[PDB]
Paper text:
As such, the Polα catalytic subunit encounters two types of DNA substrates during the primer synthesis: an RNA:DNA helix that is handed over to it by the primase subunits and then a DNA:DNA helix during subsequent DNA synthesis.
The catalytic core of hPolα (residues 339 to 1259 of the p180 subunit) was crystallized with a 13-nt primer DNA/18-nt template DNA from a mix containing Mg2+ and dCTP. There are four polymerase-DNA (binary) complexes in the crystallographic asymmetric unit. When compared to the human Polα ternary structure, the fingers domain in our binary structure is rotated outwards by ~22°. Strikingly, the portion of DNA:DNA helix in contact with the polymerase has a mixed A-B conformation while the portion of the duplex outside of the contact region remains in the standard B-form. The Polα catalytic core binds the two substrates with similar affinities, namely with a Kd of ~320 nM to the RNA:DNA helix and with a Kd of ~430 nM to the DNA:DNA helix.
Author numbering: 338 to 673, 680 to 808, 836 to 881, 898 to 1245
The structure:
Amino acid sequence: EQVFHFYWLDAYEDQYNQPGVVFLFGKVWIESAETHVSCCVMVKNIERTLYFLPREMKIDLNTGKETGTPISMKDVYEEFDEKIATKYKIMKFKSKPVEKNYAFEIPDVPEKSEYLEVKYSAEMPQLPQDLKGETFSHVFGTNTSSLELFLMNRKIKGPCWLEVKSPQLLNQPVSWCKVEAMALKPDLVNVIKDVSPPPLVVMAFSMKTMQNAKNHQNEIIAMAALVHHSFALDKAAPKPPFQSHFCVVSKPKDCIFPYAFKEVIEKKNVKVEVAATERTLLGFFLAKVHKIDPDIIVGHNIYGFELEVLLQRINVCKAPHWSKIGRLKRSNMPKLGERNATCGRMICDVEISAKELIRCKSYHLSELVQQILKTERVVIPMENIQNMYSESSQLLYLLEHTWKDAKFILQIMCELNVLPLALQITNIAGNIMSRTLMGGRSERNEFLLLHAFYENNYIVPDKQIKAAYAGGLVLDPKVGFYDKFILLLDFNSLYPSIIQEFNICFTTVQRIPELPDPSLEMGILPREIRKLVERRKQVKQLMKQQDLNPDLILQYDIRQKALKLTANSMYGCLGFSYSRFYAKPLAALVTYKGREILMHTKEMVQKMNLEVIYGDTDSIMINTNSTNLEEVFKLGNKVKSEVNKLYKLLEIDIDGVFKSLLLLKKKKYAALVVEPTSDGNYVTKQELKGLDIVRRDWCDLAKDTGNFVIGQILSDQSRDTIVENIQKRLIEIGENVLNGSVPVSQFEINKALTKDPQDYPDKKSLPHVHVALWINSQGGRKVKAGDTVSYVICQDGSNLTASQRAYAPEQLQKQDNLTIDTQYYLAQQIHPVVARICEPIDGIDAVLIATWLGLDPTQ
DNA sequence: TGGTAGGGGAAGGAT
DNA sequence: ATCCTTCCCCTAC
């Protein structure tokens, strides 16, 4: 009618096949149906914003020498209209002088200058980025995308409500959405802020595949999906997290179903669809996605395998209307990039989201359900699924398996709160939520700065087509065991505070660059960090209120977590070499100040006649030689106030006291963290950092025994009795290994691949790659980059190195000639872990520990 | 398609 | 054989 109000969620831009158009996809309220439906708004006529920086004097391009003719704003306009717009076939365009700010990597560019803003249609040819001219030295905005221009010009900071003044009917239906509208010019789209976000339609799904006998390509056997139609991002997840479901199952070419599938299913009353051929199955799933019309599709291992196979089978089987997997009608699918295949619908891979929120040995679905959902997952081998087609009782269990997998995925998504958190991360950064779910953290802070400099009238850098600088300072530790109270001080968010304290920005230094006059106004980068900290503070104050909605404290918690996660990732965007806002000088300047701030702090504490024993990037550990917390906390604040007297915004605080400390090496120690109580007298928990028992590349047999040793060293017992308890247990573990009392899960060590196992220089050298190649030889799910492979080295009767004798745990039970190397774990795993832990404590030796396990003492 | 600093292991030369 | 550098993966900040 007069206006069109909708809540945008995703955007799609086709740079090559349709330039200057940005498709928006979101929700809109239909009062007649009393439900939100999917809508697609087509924003047309996105201009090409260019900026020509005029030279001081007109020079000839061939000679490159000064001709002595001054360059004016009319002369630079002449060269474009005469020699540039004609040579590159730019018929119609616009021109207007403007003043833009700049503070980035291109040299010989003033901070403030007069540029020639030129706007023309995106359907016209694009200029070269390195274009030079007789009147202008450089040109910006050459390859700026339509989506970027639209999001910046209209201040679209994340998913929000938009009004579309003067909406237009679409000639032919371009989208798979319920409602469609068109915008003539980007100026017709504004941001509405006083409206609550709408619930979303979420669909988590899973699928089971199988390799064909003739061709090695996969084949979709069964798919299941759970749907919830009012999944709110503003509050907790619904219980149950799904309202409806559908399950599909088909046959391969040379396979037929067990008897009476329909009747038995009709008898079981389970809502299961039977497809004759796989092509019939895919058409059913596409039509279900089209009718459900979800905003977010959830699954596991989507980009690595599942989505790539789904598109491939649809292409092979020639299933009609492939583009229904997204929301925009398209004639042909891209080659399998390919992330822009489900445009209009967000893709959530729980295995990817888990890698950003939690820490696990392996991030496959089976391991996630064991750690998050506290329930075991049974997986069907890809070799036994062919025999599962013999009896329907074995095949109906196959559907129930994948159907239960879809529920696990949906349950994992809810427990991690990835949807409510991703929206907050997107509304803070001001990017696209689909990119937040999948893309890295670099693209987010890239958008946060692209907005910040657009707000302040800056020309942002164009999108480009060992280490590199010094980092933190780790003081050398005073190795040993400490019986007295150890005090730990550190600076909260040092690098963000360093930026504010010293006004470090692209604009404040002459980037080589050194800190500016403290009288200078706060730069753009520090002022943005100041906002996030102030915003996080205000949210913290809101959590203090009483008589408040119990659902708000959970949402306020999600928000304040996002504010910190954004402010802390700001530094990393400066050191990333492929970052749009790459500034290695600024990154080195920050890290240098951190070292100087730490070094000056350590020397200040030493001048106070205090002994510092360890210090990492921002922390300092002080040995007090006192057993009274009244004097430790008094001395804790005395050092605190003395340090904070030097910095305006940077502050240091007590991070806890240590009852006992086992400081082994750099970044490796164990302590008993003092926790204050209402009684005024502490209770202690242990903290493990850097020790081999904390890592995941050591077996659980050595990590559990080492954790028992750490508990004995930090214990409040006599020195003569601690060594007795370790002896009695270290000889016991040496007996249960050869006796077989310990499970096989205690012998597996986990290492992940940083590249493809075939792309390694030598696979027989590294153990985990040799096991990865064996998994890739089987029919089971492949092991690609980033995947963690658990392996158990065995005894195959060969005198090859213990690393060359590395096998998979599944090979130990299958092959009877592979047995657990008993002497290896007692000498190469359990011994060095316990030996390095007991190195500073007097009494336990390396050879004495080896004699306890039961091996030839040579140490 | 955040960073550097650092430990602990094994491979692969050179000797 | 041993010494040494290189590469590997995982950590702490």
